[PDB]
Structures are given as structure tokens and as C-alpha cells.
């Protein structure tokens, strides 16, 4: 009942399975090429017009499934080179959506889901063994998601529910690294996660924010980073962890032009930053050494500046600012230093040095 | 110089001519009976023993010629009822050869030639106007040729050059139908052509094949069917065309138990099947609609299955299989669908659905 | 490089400035609390162990500076309530030194300096406007200095250079009163100054004396009292002035158990007492009236008794005693009486009555 549909299957090898089901639609194109043994390719295009699906499998027992239900000019591309790679692509009711999966290696699992939307771009590139990647885009226009995993046992999750021009970039290199990016609504949100090493945990969330920027960089082992930005405009969060067992938490609820920066070098350092609204609030938490604990809390409108630097072992620091223009700088050197700063009002200046 | 020859002439009517010339031979029998006006009968038996010739003409200006040169127990029978019918029988150096011509109507031309061989049976039955039939048997034992034409301007050709137990059956009903059967060598080859309608062209060729079966069935106008089977054992070819301007071509070169099936309903449908060797290769090409183009090619040893179904207008399909056990099923529905499937190797499974 | 230092800043209001600098040291504690507008707090702890600094400012533009360089268990406390109050505390190389400043009012200036020593206690309490107080303690053990000023333009100075268990007490109530206490060496020296009124001048000096007691009490306007005790043990000086323009001078150079008493009531009375060594020398100078002039001089070992009483206007009296056990009693009544007594030797008894 559909006019001008095109389907091509090319199989070289032993026990290769290719299934193409084009039910309805005008000028749908499906191509499945399998070189090797035991490769499985499934393509299902339903009610879509000018939809393009391309699957290219090389190796042993590679599995690829593409399901495009409706939509105009949807493009899906799967390229598997290796053994036991699993790829899944779903595109429902989207216009001009582009999905790309490129897996090289063994036992790689990649999934891309695009439910509606226009001009949504999803790209997954996995190299190595047993890497798991998921990209989900529900609604929205011009949303870009990119995942790049190299190594073993790496878990990557990217979710974009609504919004225009939201960009998510995930890069993992190493073993057993977990990275998660969530963007629920908002325009021009940029999230970037970069993990190098073993067993690193990174999570970023941007809810209903415009022009929010989150950057997480982890190098080493067992580093945990969590970033939340809710209902804020032009908020910037930066996390940099080098070493082992470092824990960083950043929360920015509302506000415009709020900047949070966490820098940790060493083992078992804990940093927490909380910003509740306000304009031009700046928080810096630097911990060089082992077993550092730092807490920064800001609530107020206008140019609140907090800096907490801890060098050495087991230094404890707490800074709380409430009001306008409060400036607090705490620098701890040595072992077992404890600092507590509480500022309320306008124009408070506090300098704490604990050598 | 020959002992016990018998010749009988019985003519009733005006200007009937009967000539019997028995030169040499023992116990040759010739009988010519002509009832009507202007009938011409010629019998010439030379050097044959126990040869029997019978001519029976009824009507106006019927012409019959029988020439038996040598041979043992050769039997020729001509029965013409009508006007201007022409019958020719030639039997050279054959033993126990039986030739039968039965023409009823006007301007019918029938020719039977048997050069050598033992127990060869040729039968021509024409009813109608201006039908042309030719049967030729050169050598071979127990070869059976049968032609049955009813209607106007029908052309039938049957040729059997060598081989044992080869059976050719030709049936034409209608106007201006052309049918040709050729069997060059081989044992137990069966060819059957059945044409109903106007201006149908059918040609079947079996060269040096054993137990080959060809069946062609055409109903309608301007249908063209061509079947070639060369050097194959137990190969089966089936062509079924219903409608107008349908073109079917089947080629089977070598192989054992290869099956080709073409089914066309409609106007201007084109189907081509090529099988090059192999065992248990199966090809099915079904075209329901108008202006369909289908091509199936199989090369490989073992259970290659190809199915190409096209429903509607101007659907184009190509299936190519090389190797062992390849299975391809393509189903096109709608208008202007294009499908291309290429399989190489062992165990390839391809399913193409273009609705 | 220092372990376990603690610093706390709490600012409520507008344009408050708090600076805490802890360079080196073990377990140093600094706290700065500022409620109000424009308050300035500076704390600097260097190389000290277990040093405690507390600053509490309430009001407008209060200034407090504390500098503790080294020492063990040094405690500094500043409490300002009001506007434009200035407080300065310096503690250098002292152990267990306690400094307390409490200013309530406007434009009060208080300074405490403790250079070395163990268990030195300094306390300043100012209530009012533009009062200036200074306490200095250089060396010594268990030295106690207390200043209490109430009113306007009051100047208080306390100095203790060396010595053990030296006690200085200064009390001023009124306007433009100047009081000075100096203790250079000696053990168990007690100095007490009490001024009530306007423009009163009091100065007490104790140099290298043990168990010396000085008491000055001034009530009224423009009263001048000067007391000097040098190199004496158990010497007692008492000055009591009531009225206007009264001048009292007491000098005690050496000696044991020497007693000097000056009592003046009225306007423009002049009293001078000189004691040069000796044991149990007693001098009494009483002037009730206006424009009295009295001079008492004692030089000798043992129970020298001098009494000069002047009642009325412009009475002039001079008593000179040289030797042992001289007793002189002069009583002047009336106007313009002149008395001159000179005793030399042992056991001289003089009685002068000028009615």
C-alpha cells in the first residue's frame, strides 16, 4: 500500500540472519549488510515517509535492531565491528532525527531512543569490551547527544526530555566508569562529562534551566561527582577531581550567573557546595591533600564570594553566607584544622587563615 | 522382385488422383481411399518389409503424401476430412514406427518425419482452418510425440533427436498460437505445452537431460514463454501465464532436482529465472498486476530457495543467490517498488517486505 | 604548619570588616563578632599555643585590633557597645596573660599592652564619651591593673614595669580628669586613685619599693596630687582633696613604715611633704580653708611625728625635723599666720598655736 519502498540485504558468511519489514509509508529505504558468522539484523519501518535505515555488521554474532515508527526523513545508522555487539535504535514520530551507533570490539551494548522531536541528533561510539551506552531523547528540537566510551565495563547514560538546543557530551576512558547526564527541559543547556580511570561515578542533572553549563572532569579511581542545577539561568558548575575516593557535590537551585567550582587532589576528599538563588554568586572549594571536608552554602542576591582552600590532612571547613555581597576567604594549612564562618547581611568581609 | 505386396485404391468422385509405387520389399501393404473431388494421394514404399500405409481422404482437393523407405513393420495413417488439407509422412529406415495424421477442416498442413529408430510414435490431430503442425523424430527408441491443434493459424513444432522414452505433448486452442518443443537426447524427458487464446508464443528446449519435466500453460493474448533445460537430471520447470503481453524466461543449466516456477497474471509482466547447477534449488516468481519485472539467479549446491512476489504496478525485483542453503523471500506491494537482494555463502536468510 | 587552629567570624549589618590571621601555633582560637554598621575587627595570632582572642562589637564604626605574638594560654577579650570606639590589645611572649577591654559609648579609646610575664591581668572599663585609657605591663608575675572611667574626656594611664603581685586601681568619674599610676619594680605594691569631678590631675609613682601603699582621693575641680615613693618598704601615702585648685605633693625616698597624710578642703591650698628615709616617721598636713601653704620635711631614723593644721585664709606653715623622735605640732587659726619650726636631735617636742 506504500509506494516506492526500497530494501536491500547483503549477507556474506555462515548463519547470518537479516529481516526487513517495511509496512506502509512512501519511499522508505532500508539496507542491511552482514559480513561474518551469526550476525542478526532486524529493521522495521512502519508508516514513515523517506526514512533511511543502514546496518553494517562485521564479525561473529553481532545483533542490531532498528525500529522506525512513522516520521519524516528519519535516519538510523548502525556500524558494528567485532563480536557479540548489541545495538538498538528506536525512532517514533520524529522528523529529521539522526541516530548513529558505532561499536568496535566485544560484547558492547548501545541503545538510542528518540520519541518525537525535530532535528534531534544522537551519536554513540564504543570501543572495547562490555561497554553499555544509552541515549534517550523525548521531544525537543535540535537536541544533540554524544557518547564516547573506550575501555571495559563503562556505563554511560544520556537523557534529554524536551528543550531546544540542549547539548550533552560524555567521554569515558578506562574500566568500570559510570557517567549519567540528565536534561529535563530548558534551552541551550550544555553538559560535559570526562572520566579517565577506574570505577569513577559522575552524575549531572539540569532541570528547567536556560544556558546552564556543567563540566565534570575525573581522573583516577573511585571518584564520585554529583551536580544538580534546577531552574537557573547562566549557571556554571565545574568539578575537577584527581586521585582516589574523592566526593564532590554541587547544588544550584535557581539564580542567574551563579558559579560553583570544586577542585580536589588526593584521597578521600569531600566537598559540598550549595547555592540557593542569587545573582553572580561565586563559590570555590579547593582541597589538596587527604581526608578534607569542605562545605559552602550561599543564599542571597548579589556577588556573594566564598573561597575555601584546604591543604594537608583532615582539615574541616564550613562557610555560610546569607545576604548581599558577602565575601569569605578561608585557607587551612596543616592537620586537623577546623574553620567555621557565618556571615549575614550586606558587605561582610571575612578572612580566616589557619596555618 | 518383391513377394506378396498388396496395394488397393478406391476412388469415388470427380478428378481424384491416386498413385501407389511399391518398389521392392516383402509383404508391403498400401491402401488409398478418396471420396470427393480433386483429392490427391501418393504412396511410395521402397525396400521395406511388412510396411503398412493407409490414406483416407474425404472432401475437395485434399493432398496426402506418404514415403516409407525401408524398415520393418512401419505403419502410416492419414485421415483428412475437409478441403485443401495437406498431409506429409516420411519414414526412413525405422522399425515398428507409427505415424498418424488426422486433419479435419480447411487448409490444414501436417508433416511427420521419422528418420530411423524403433517404436517411435507420432500423432498429429488438427481441427479448424490453416493450422500448421510438424513432428520430427531422428533416431531413438520409444519416443512419443503428440500435437493437438484446434482453431485458426496455429503453428506447432515438435522435434526429438535421439533419446529413449521422451514424451512431447502440445495442445493449442485458438488463433495464431505458436508452440515449439525440442528434445535433443536424454531419457524419460517430458515436455507439455498448453496454449489457449490468441498469438501466444511458447518454446521449450531440453538438451541432453534425463527425467526433465517442462510444463507451460498460457491463457490469453501475446504471451511469450521460453524454457531451456540443459544437461540436468530431474529438473522441473513450470510456467503459468494468464493475460496479455506476459514474458517468462526460465534457464536451468545442469543440476539435479532443480525447481523453477513462474506465475504471471496481468499485462506486460516480465519474469526471468536462471539456475546454474546445484541440487534442490527452488525458485518461485509470482507477479500479479501490470508491468512487473522480476529476476532470480541461483548458483550453488544445496537447497537454495528464492521467492519473489510482486503485486500491483511497475514493481522491480532482483534476487541473486550464490552458495549453499541461501533463502531469500521478497514481497513487493504497491507501485514502483524496487528490491535488490544479494546473498553469498552458506545459510543466509533474507526477508524483504516493501508494502 | 600549625595544628588545630580555630577561627570564627560572625558579621551582621552593613560594611563590616573582619580579618583573622593565625600564622603558626598549636590550637589557637580567634572569634570576631560584629553587629551593626562599619565595624572593623583585626586579630593576628603568631607562633602562640592555646591563645584565645574574642572580639564583640555592637554599633557603628567600632574598631578593635588584637595582636598576640607567641605565648602560652594568652586570653584577650574586647567588648565594644556604641559608636566610634577604638580598642587595641597587644600580648607579646606572655604566659597565661589576661587582657579585657569593655567600652560602652562614643569615641572611647582603650589600649592594653602586655610584653612578657606570667599571669598578668589587665582590665579596662570605659563608659561615656571620648575617654582614653592605657594599660602597660612589661614583665612581672601576677600583676593586676584595673581602670574604670565614667564620663567625658577622661585620661587614665597605668604602667607596671616588672615586679610581682603589684596592684594598680584607677577610678575616674566626671569630665577631663587625668590619672597616672607608675610602678617600676617591687613586690606587693598597691596604688589606688579615685577622682570625682572636673579637670583633676593625679599622679602616683612607686619605684623599686616593697609593700608600698598609695591612695589618692580627689573631689571637685582642678585638684592636683603628686605622690612619689622610691626604694621604701611598707610606706603609706594618703592624699584627700575636696574643692578647687588644691595642690598636694608627697615624696618618700627610702625608709620603712613611713606614713604621709595630706587632707585639703577649700580653694587653692598647697601642701608639700618630704620624707628622706627613717622608720615610723609620721607626717600629717591638714588645710581647711583657702590659700593655705604647708611644708613638712622629715629626715631621721625613728618615730618622727609632724602635724601641721591650718584653718582659714593664707596661713603659712613650715616644719623641719632632723634626727630621732622629734615631735612637732603646729595649729594655725585665722588669717596670714606664719609658723616656722626647726628641730634637730633626739626627743625634741614643739607645740605652736597661732590663734
Residue numbers in the entry:
A (entry chain B), B (entry chain A), C (entry chain C): 1 to 355
From the primary publication:
As a representative structure of CS-class CsgA monomers we discuss the AF2 model of A0A0E3UX01 (pLDDT=93.68), which has 15 curlin repeats and an additional half repeat at the C-terminus (hereafter referred to as R15.5). AF2 predicts a highly regular (the average main chain RMSD between consecutive repeats is 0.18 ± 0.02 Å), left-handed β-solenoid with a negligible twist (average main chain RMSD of top 5 AF2 models: 0.48 ± 0.38 Å). A transversal, on-axis view provides further insight into the structural nature of the steric zipper, which comprises a central hydrophobic core composed of the Ψ1 and Ψ2 residues in motif a and b, flanked on either side by a glutamine (Gln), followed by an asparagine (Asn), forming the pseudo centrosymmetric core predicted based on motif a and b sequence features. However, R15.5 has an uneven number of strands (i.e., 31), resulting in a motif a overhang both at N and C-termini. Rather, a proper match of two motif a overhangs across a dimer interface would require a fiber consisting of consecutive head-head—tail–tail interactions, or head-to-tail interactions with a twofold screw, i.e., 180° rotation of consecutive subunits along the fiber long axis. Disulfide formation of Cys residues introduced across the R15.5 interface occurred in accordance with a 21 screw axis, and also de novo prediction by AF2 showed a head-to-tail 21 screw in the subunit-subunit interface. For this we selected R15.5 due to its high Asp and Glu content (20%; pI = 2.98) leading us to hypothesize that R15.5 protofibrils would be less prone to tangle up because of repulsive electrostatics. The R15.5 side-view is nearly identical to the side-view of E. coli curli, suggesting that ex vivo curli and in vitro R15.5 fibrils are structurally equivalent at the fold level and essentially in agreement with AF2 predictions. The docking of an R15.5 AF2 model shows good agreement between the experimental cryoEM volume and the predicted β-solenoidal architecture. The reported Refine3D volume therefore represents a map that is longitudinally averaged over the curlin repeats.
